[PDB]
Amino acid sequence: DYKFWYTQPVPKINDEFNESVNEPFISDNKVEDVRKDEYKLPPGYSWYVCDVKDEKDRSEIYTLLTDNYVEDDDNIFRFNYSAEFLLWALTSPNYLKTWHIGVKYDASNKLIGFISAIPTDICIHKRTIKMAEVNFLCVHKTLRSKRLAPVLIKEITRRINLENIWQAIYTAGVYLPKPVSDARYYHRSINVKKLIEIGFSSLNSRLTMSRAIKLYRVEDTLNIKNMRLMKKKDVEGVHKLLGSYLEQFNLYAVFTKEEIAHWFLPIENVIYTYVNEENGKIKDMISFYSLPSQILGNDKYSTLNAAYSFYNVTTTATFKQLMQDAILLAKRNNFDVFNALEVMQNKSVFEDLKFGEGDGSLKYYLYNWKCASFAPAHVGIVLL
Numbered sequence: 130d131y132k133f134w135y136t137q138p139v140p141k142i143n144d145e146f147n148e149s150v151n152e153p154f155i156s157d158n159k160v161e162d163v164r165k166d167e168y169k170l171p172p173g174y175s176w177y178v179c180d181v182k183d184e185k186d187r188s189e190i191y192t193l194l195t196d197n198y199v200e201d202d203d204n205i206f207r208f209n210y211s212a213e214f215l216l217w218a219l220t221s222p223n224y225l226k227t228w229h230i231g232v233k234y235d236a237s238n239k240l241i242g243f244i245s246a247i248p249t250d251i252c253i254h255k256r257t258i259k260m261a262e263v264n265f266l267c268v269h270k271t272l273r274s275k276r277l278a279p280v281l282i283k284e285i286t287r288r289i290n291l292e293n294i295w296q297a298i299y300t301a302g303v304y305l306p307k308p309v310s311d312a313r314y315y316h317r318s319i320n321v322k323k324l325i326e327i328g329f330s331s332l333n334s335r336l337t338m339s340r341a342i343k344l345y346r347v348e349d350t351l352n353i354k355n356m357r358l359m360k361k362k363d364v365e366g367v368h369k370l371l372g373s374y375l376e377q378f379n380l381y382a383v384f385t386k387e388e389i390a391h392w393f394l395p396i397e398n399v400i401y402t403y404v405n406e407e408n409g410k411i412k413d414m415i416s417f418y419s420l421p422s423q424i425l426g427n428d429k430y431s432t433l434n435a436a437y438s439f440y441n442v443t444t445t446a447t448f449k450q451l452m453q454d455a456i457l458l459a460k461r462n463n464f465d466v467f468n469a470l471e472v473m474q475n476k477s478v479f480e481d482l483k484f485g486e487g488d489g490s491l492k493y494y495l496y497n498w499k500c501a502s503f504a505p506a507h508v509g510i511v512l513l
């Protein structure tokens with residue numbers, strides 16, 4: 130019925146809008162009128178602002194998500210964001226500590242709920258808007274189905290409105306009111322043996338074990354000879370390359386020089402970025418971040434090291450050759466699989482590069498904004 134979401138400024142389930150519609154639901158808001166008090170919690174619980182730059186607070190969030198975050202439809206995987214990943218995803222330029230919200234069970238002083246947001250400039254249908262990017266909403270498994278998630282959402286909505294920000298962007302695998310775009314995800318096997326032993330990939334008389342190994346074997350030779358790890362000196366070249374590339378889409382982020390350095394400069398086991406420099410110009414780039422999935426119950430393996438496509442731009446080669454090199458670069462760094470969405474130009478290389486369609490899709494949502502839905506090929510942003 131969507132009893133909570135019906136009260137929020139988002140499209141009703143049966144709402145559509147014209148291409149030309151591109152405006153908020155509620156405008157002319159005043160920070161002065163925002164609630165100054167925290168939303169009440171049940172007796173025995175208290176809000177807790179998290180300092181992600183502190184190892185203890187950061188480790189408390191890690192344990193919460195490690196034990197209670199998203200699982201697949203078959204209950205064999207659970208996302209296992211590393212502590213360093215969370216530090217990277219939450220300390221972007223001009224972040225606010227007050228947007229890293231948790232809830233504690235006072236008796237044990239244990240964290241049981243969390244939600245976060247970061248500020249980002251988002252362009253939607255040619256209009257650049259200051260928005261909040263929400264992520265990492267989690268409620269402990271022992272307290273599910275107790276209307277705790279709406280409180281987390283309402284509280285962080287208040288903290289964001291207190292900063293004079295009234296729009297937000299988020300994604301989720303579940304269907305809510307209402308997606309502006311819906312993108313199926315795909316996977317590219319690398320460690321064929323491991324993906325079979327754990328039961329993710331299948332075999333049959335046509336595709337045997339040995340035939341499957343040969344099929345997904347990758348050549349260890351880059352199509353772009355000079356693709357190398359990104360460095361500080363490349364920030365400006367990437368800013369120009371990526372900025373120019375994203376203007377062709379209906380939904381993307383507008384990066385500053387500072388944001389480019391944060392979101393792309395490589396970090397081991399977190400973010401990988403490679404670039405090709407010709408005549409002192411950055412002409413091609415590849416990027417993918419690391420998000421392992423704990424293998425639930427398996428006594429042999431503990432995690433499935435997955436790599437997720439981020440932002441890839443080529444001006445001197447074909448997109449086919451580019452994503453092909455991305456897979457190899459992920460293989461060289463000991464990743465078991467390469468995952469991507471059908472956004473930007475990704476869909477044009479899935480068949481040729483032997484991707485496999487997954488079970489579900491990822492929906493893109495906007496808070497307090499009216500605009501027409503569009504195909505995922507017009508989406509030019511990837512959230513963590």
Ligand SMILES: CCCCCCCCCCCCCC(=O)SCCNC(=O)CCNC(=O)[C@H](O)C(C)(C)COP(=O)(O)OP(=O)(O)OC[C@H]1O[C@@H](n2cnc3c(N)ncnc32)[C@H](O)[C@@H]1OP(=O)(O)O
Pocket residue numbers: 130131132133134135197198199200261263264265266267268269272273274275276277278279282285286289290294295296297299300301302303305496497
């Ligand atoms: C301008 C600033 C605005 C800022 C805010 C903008 C909006 C932010 C939106 C959040 C961005 C998320 C970004 C990410 O990280 S997406 C992935 C979210 N995380 C997980 O799935 C981890 C594992 N699962 C859980 O932790 C819990 O099951 C969660 C927390 C998901 C719900 O807890 P629980 O299962 O214990 O239920 P409840 O009794 O509290 O309450 C049920 C209500 O919650 C609505 N629900 C369920 N799942 C989601 C979902 N993924 N996004 C939004 N709403 C969701 C549902 O429609 C229902 O509403 P209604 O059907 O009654 O109406």
Ligand SMILES: Cc1c(CCOc2ccc3ccccc3c2-c2ccnc(N3CCNCC3)c2)c(C(=O)N2CCOCC2)nn1C
Pocket residue numbers: 199200201202206207208300301302314315316422433435437466468469470487490491512513
């Ligand atoms: C929930 C889950 C799943 C379901 C598959 O999920 C995929 C697969 C591919 C995606 C590609 C791009 C973007 C999102 C992709 C997603 C996806 C789907 C739904 N939500 C999210 N996230 C939460 C919201 N913010 C972004 C991240 C990601 C698996 C799993 O089967 N594999 C993961 C490891 O590689 C092999 C297979 N393991 N686990 C813990």
Ligand SMILES: [Cl-]
Pocket residue numbers: 146147148149501
């Ligand atoms: Cl239209």
Ligand SMILES: [Cl-]
Pocket residue numbers: 349350351354
């Ligand atoms: Cl090479």
Ligand SMILES: [Cl-]
Pocket residue numbers: 443446447448
């Ligand atoms: Cl191209």
Ligand SMILES: [Cl-]
Pocket residue numbers: 484485486
């Ligand atoms: Cl398929």
Ligand SMILES: [Cl-]
Pocket residue numbers: 502503504507
């Ligand atoms: Cl469209």
